[PDB]
């Protein structure tokens, strides 16, 4: 016994060593888990903190049954963490913590109903600058709150689950986009959500890679210069287009040179000082 | 020397293709706009809005 | 699930448990595995034994009894905890006392099941402790008799050295694995067998 605190303490210090910058927790955390918790747990660092709250849950997976309400007993504690708290890092973080303790069903659906977390998810699904990253976790925390209703009987939080709705435009585009990932996601959401619910509602190819390079025939959109007035001034406005990497050709002995539209204006600039 | 500066477009055409180009200026009706000049043998100051036609055309010729 | 299955689990009681410093975790783990077990097939029973310094016990004796299982493997070990037999005042454990406990009680089950079709058990081993020589005649009766049953035995063996098991799992054609890694027992009794 007296062995297993100092055990899982050296591992409790190295996740507090390597906590704060990059992603280290992980690996460590799931090891941590096994071996009140969460009241203990909150006074350390978020970061980690969550992660160990993230996995603890998922490792569950008769005492079985007393550590499952023993979690359900300071679920709060954890929500309250998780607000407040609330980059796309952790952003992760929260919601897949989130989702986490959703598959647990140990989360009260009111209370979850009222709270910004939920705004949150769809607030980043609605965006349209947030990364692939960041999408797949709150796509996931989306789907495990309507997987943790299991009745929609009784659950405030099959209403504000309809937040979904409001995605549609974000599917527009992304499907604009190629954006195959997000589309995915989507998709999850809508199956997701009537999966809940759903009760109450009602060669031949070696002339097609030649056809797709057809498809692809070279030139460039471009500004010419010439009549420049002393060599001096080729020289000069040559270099500090190589230096931009926009030079297309150059030609000395005609005092003429080509630079690609994408810098016309850093040659503009320089054109008038000096 | 940043005398005159003008919108075109470069093309980094082979030495087979280019004189087509020519060809294609010259011999032509509503063209020989197309050209503004040939700077190096490899490469032309063409178009712009000729492009599209240029590139079209010598897909369609052979 | 149309096989009955019982599975075995000896327990080793040493206080070598001590070096382990937890069989509290420990006993938490074997439950979470049980219960595992018992939900994935209504035919599977469960039977658990400890293996003692002095002598071998029955911890008990369905998945619907787990809350009973629960209860009476906590209550077991508490009066098992002893100062006899304390730290290695005794290196080895009645294994083979244990090994017999458990024949009998899957020969028992097995008439009754005899009435119906056939059952399938396996008797899987936590072990802590040492071998002896003493050990040899009686360990292997109860090994032999299990092979020629086709009973496999299986063993984890979380520390020590009982060389014993390990050849009782390669006769009987069960499972031997030392554990590096004692806090994996988990992982180990869900993935190892």
């Not at chain 3, 783990?29 to 400890?50: D, E, Q, T, Y």
Request: proline share 3%; hydrophobic share 45%; aromatic share 8%.
């Amino acid at each position: 016994p007296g062995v297993l605190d100092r055990l899982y303490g050296h591992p409790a210090t190295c996740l507090a060593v390597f906590r704060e910058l990059p992603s280290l927790a992980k690996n460590w955390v799931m090891r941590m888990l096994f071996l009140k918790k969460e009241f203990s747990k909150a006074q350390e660092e978020s970061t980690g903190l969550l992660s160990g709250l993230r996995i603890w849950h998922t490792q569950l997976l008769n005492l079985r049954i007393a550590l499952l309400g023993g979690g359900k007993a300071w679920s709060d504690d954890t929500s309250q963490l998780g607000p407040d708290k609330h980059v796309l890092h952790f952003m992760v973080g929260s919601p897949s913590a989130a989702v986490s303790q959703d598959l647990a069903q140990l989360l009260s659906q009111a209370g979850l109903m009222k709270s910004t977390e939920p705004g949150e998810p769809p607030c980043i699904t609605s965006a349209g600058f947030q990364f692939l990253l960041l999408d797949t976790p709150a796509q996931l925390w989306y789907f495990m709150l309507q997987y943790l209703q299991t009745a929609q009987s009784r659950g405030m939080d099959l209403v504000e689950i309809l937040s979904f709705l409001f995605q549609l435009s974000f599917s527009t585009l992304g499907k604009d986009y190629s954006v195959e990932g997000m589309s995915d996601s989507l998709l999850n959401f809508l199956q997701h959500l009537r999966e809940f619910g759903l009760v109450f509602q009602r060669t031949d190819q070696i002339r097609l890679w030649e056809l797709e390079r057809d498809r692809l025939r070279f030139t460039e959109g471009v500004l010419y210069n010439q009549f420049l007035s002393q060599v001096d001034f080729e020289l000069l406005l040559a270099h500090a287009r190589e230096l931009g990497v926009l030079v297309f050709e150059n030609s000395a002995k005609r005092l003429m040179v080509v630079t690609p539209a994408g810098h016309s204006d850093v040659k503009r600039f320089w054109k008038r000082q000096k | 020397m940043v005398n005159v500066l003008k919108g075109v477009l470069i093309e980094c055409d082979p030495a087979m293709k280019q004189f087509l180009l020519y060809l294609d200026e010259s011999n032509a009706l509503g063209k020989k706009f197309i050209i503004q000049d040939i700077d190096d043998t490899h490469v032309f100051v063409i178009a712009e809005l000729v492009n599209v036609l240029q590139e079209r055309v010598g897909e369609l010729m052979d | 699930e149309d096989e009955l299955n019982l599975l075995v689990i000896v327990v080793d009681a040493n206080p070598i448990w001590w070096g382990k410093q937890t069989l509290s975790k420990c006993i938490d783990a074997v439950m979470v595995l049980g219960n595992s077990h018992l939900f994935m097939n209504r035919s599977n029973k469960l039977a658990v034994i400890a293996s003692h310094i002095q002598e071998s016990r029955f911890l008990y004796p369905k998945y619907e009894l787990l809350t009973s299982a629960n209860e009476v493997i906590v209550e077991e070990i508490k009066d098992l905890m002893t100062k006899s037999d304390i730290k290695g005042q005794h290196t080895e454990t009645l294994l083979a006392g244990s090994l017999a406990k458990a024949l009998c009680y899957i020969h028992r089950m097995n008439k009754e099941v005899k009435d119906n079709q056939e059952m399938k058990s396996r008797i899987l081993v936590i072990k802590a402790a040492e071998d002896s020589a003493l050990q040899y005649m009686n360990f292997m009766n109860v090994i032999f008799a299990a092979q020629k049953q086709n009973i496999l035995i299986d063993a984890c063996v979380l520390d020590s050295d009982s060389g014993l098991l390990q050849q009782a799992c390669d006769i009987t054609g069960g499972l031997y694995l030392k554990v590096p890694q004692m806090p994996s027992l988990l992982q180990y009794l869900l993935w190892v067998f």
